[PDB]
């Protein structure tokens, strides 16, 4: 049967085409993950329907209700057959859903407005003049919340009680905050998005320092799903064929605006 | 039996005493509503236990699940017997819980950092240099979201799509945002809180213009609760005795710091 794909609106992975009001179904979307989905489907021999996750979240378990939300939840509760998006492979998630080998590598990074006197996480941790935060949900927020590393623990201690809140709901919001804060806000986000934004007008942001960690995005399926094996092989095959690199250049650098 | 009172941490209505770690039960709290609760209890002849609402919300119904949250939810689902807090009397709430006649009047107002070139809601609506927002929940946010009045509709249209978000989770956060935004953020909140903050150090904020609307706070009880009649009479009696005015001066002006 037709495979239900859950994804999320996150540039340049999945974006609404400017003329989406004129289009229907899968044709409404474009981006790295839209292209990858087509490639995976072709190599696994299935037809599919792209759907945007209802709550706009990646996936976390509520500590109280213990209910999974986001794309992970969609897979766990059987609402979708596969998730093709910038979904970070983490221990807690790996325990409830199946992940293909990573199709892209990344690490947490720092985004600053050009000219901000910050070069590293250590720099940020030792001052308060420049506020800094992360998305209000997701693996980056959790990285800091759970970290036992001195510098990161110090940063989380600051972030969790900073007022006003240093957390943002979407990447777009964090970028807007960096751009409109006159250098007084630094955004902690995954290197992939940071690198993409650095090449977008008004070209006033930049990624600074090295990544704080190293991980990857994986295609996810419900635990035990028979689709898992085929998808994993397709990811490895596409990587070996250079297709993944081609898609990266296509959506990040080929049409960079800076 | 002992009456379970649900309330919320909102200065100067209910605040944790600085040495609360040394205290137990009702003695941990102080404020206008803590004093009012004692007065109402005495005049209604009941003993009570103050409890802080679990989700820290005032009360709204989820459009999807249709479940009430906040203090209103606590009353609707029988978790508390009465709510004594700065709970705004609104049509939607009046339909699900009982409200005493108002114990305090108020209106939505504008808080600015001293020196901000804004004198009214109209001023705010006609510009974008100075961002402005409200709490991310509650009657003030709903006032703008539902308003059919031109100026307020224009303001909501701006607020709902402004990036980064102009909404804050708590009053403290909004105040912090006004104070740290160098005049680039104006906070829309109820006049009562605005007036209180204006008299608190560092004395860098002020209420400007008249109130946008007029309403009041009421003591709430589960719909049909027998406690409702007594509480309403106590509110009227306390007002006529001048007790409510005395409490207002006690928590707002007597010890003003500006
Ligand atoms: N990939 C993360 C989400 C995320 O975490 N930090 C960001 O900037 C973004 Br987008 C996840 O899967 O939770
Ligand atoms: N009193 C309101 C909450 C509220 O609405 N605007 C504020 O500043 C505050 Br506090 C309510 O009962 O929803």
């Amino acid at each position: 049967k037709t495979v239900v794909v859950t994804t999320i609106l996150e540039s340049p992975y999945v974006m609404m085409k400017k003329n989406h009001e004129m289009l229907e179904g899968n044709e409404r979307y474009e981006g790295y993950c839209v292209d990858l989905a087509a490639e995976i489907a072709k190599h696994c021999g299935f037809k599919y329907k792209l759907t945007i996750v209802g709550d706009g979240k990646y996936g976390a378990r509520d500590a109280d209700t213990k209910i999974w939300n986001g794309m992970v939840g969609e897979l766990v509760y059987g609402k979708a057959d596969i998730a093709i998006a910038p979904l970070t492979i983490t221990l807690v998630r790996e325990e409830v859903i199946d992940f293909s080998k990573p199709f892209m590598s990344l690490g947490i990074s720092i985004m600053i407005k050009k000219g901000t006197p910050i070069e590293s996480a250590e720099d940020l941790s030792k001052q308060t003049e420049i506020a800094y935060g992360t998305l209000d949900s997701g693996s980056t927020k959790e990285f800091f919340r759970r970290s036992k590393i001195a510098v990161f623990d110090k940063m989380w201690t600051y972030m969790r009680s900073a007022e006003p809140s240093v957390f943002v709901r979407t990447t777009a919001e964090g970028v807007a905050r960096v751009r409109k804060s006159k250098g007084k806000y630094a955004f902690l986000l995954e290197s992939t998005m940071n690198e993409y934004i650095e090449q977008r007008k008004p070209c006033d942001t930049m990624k600074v320092g090295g990544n704080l960690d190293s991980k990857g995005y994986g295609i996810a399926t419900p635990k035990g799903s028979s689709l898992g094996n085929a998808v994993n092989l397709a990811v490895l095959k596409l990587n070996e064929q250079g297709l993944l690199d081609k898609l990266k250049n296509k959506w990040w650098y080929d049409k960079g605006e800076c």
Side-chain angles (χ1 to χ4, degrees), chain A:
Chain A
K1 64 172 178 176
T2 300
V3 170
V4 176
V5 181
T6 180
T7 189
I8 186 167
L9 290 177
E10 183 74 65
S11 301
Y13 293 98
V14 178
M15 310 174 274
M16 299 303 295
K17 288 182 176 175
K18 296 309 171 185
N19 63 150
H20 69 85
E21 270 176 40
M22 300 176 229
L23 314 169
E24 309 176 316
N26 300 344
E27 304 189 347
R28 294 169 291 170
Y29 315 104
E30 71 181 335
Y32 178 102
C33 283
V34 179
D35 286 349
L36 184 55
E39 285 294 347
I40 293 297
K42 179 179 63 180
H43 286 278
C44 292
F46 65 71
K47 307 70 194 175
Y48 62 101
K49 177 179 69 181
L50 296 174
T51 64
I52 300 301
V53 62
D55 62 16
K57 296 176 180 183
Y58 284 86
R61 194 178 73 243
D62 181 289
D64 299 304
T65 69
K66 300 185 186 302
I67 299 178
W68 282 88
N69 60 36
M71 290 178 281
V72 175
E74 291 304 83
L75 298 177
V76 171
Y77 301 116
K79 304 303 182 62
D81 305 303
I82 188 170
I84 299 179
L87 185 60
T88 308
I89 300 169
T90 64
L91 174 63
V92 294
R93 290 171 175 168
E94 178 70 287
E95 300 171 355
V96 302
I97 56 179
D98 286 343
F99 273 114
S100 71
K101 289 301 185 296
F103 61 83
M104 194 178 275
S105 297
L106 62 305
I108 293 173
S109 62
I110 303 172
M111 174 188 286
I112 58 164
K113 183 172 182 296
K114 287 180 175 182
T116 303
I118 292 293
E119 291 172 46
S120 68
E122 182 60 275
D123 282 349
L124 283 175
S125 77
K126 297 176 172 175
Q127 60 82 64
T128 58
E129 179 56 37
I130 303 167
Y132 54 89
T134 68
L135 286 178
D136 56 33
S137 65
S139 61
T140 298
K141 183 179 182 184
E142 292 311 308
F143 171 85
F144 285 99
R145 187 182 85 72
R146 307 294 294 290
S147 182
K148 300 303 182 295
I149 297 177
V151 175
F152 304 142
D153 170 292
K154 184 176 181 59
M155 289 173 70
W156 174 249
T157 299
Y158 155 77
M159 295 186 262
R160 66 188 294 280
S161 66
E163 295 196 316
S165 179
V166 293
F167 302 106
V168 298
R169 286 190 172 185
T170 68
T171 298
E173 199 194 320
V175 178
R177 194 166 174 179
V178 170
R179 289 174 167 161
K180 300 177 181 184
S181 296
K182 308 183 179 184
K184 303 304 181 178
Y185 184 73
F187 187 36
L188 290 154
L189 74 172
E190 300 180 321
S191 60
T192 47
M193 287 74 174
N194 199 349
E195 294 166 349
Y196 168 71
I197 298 301
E198 185 176 297
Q199 302 311 310
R200 301 295 293 178
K201 291 187 176 184
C203 311
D204 58 347
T205 68
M206 69 160 42
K207 163 176 156 50
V208 293
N211 296 342
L212 289 56
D213 68 351
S214 298
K215 52 205 167 184
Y217 298 143
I219 299 302
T221 46
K223 206 173 186 67
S225 168
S226 60
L227 187 59
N229 178 55
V231 169
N232 182 55
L233 294 181
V235 171
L236 295 178
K237 188 166 179 180
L238 292 174
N239 180 50
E240 283 170 28
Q241 288 176 168
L243 187 283
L244 300 182
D245 289 314
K246 171 165 150 291
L247 290 185
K248 181 66 153 58
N249 290 322
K250 174 182 177 182
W251 296 100
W252 269 257
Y253 314 116
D254 283 343
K255 292 184 174 182
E257 308 178 304
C258 306

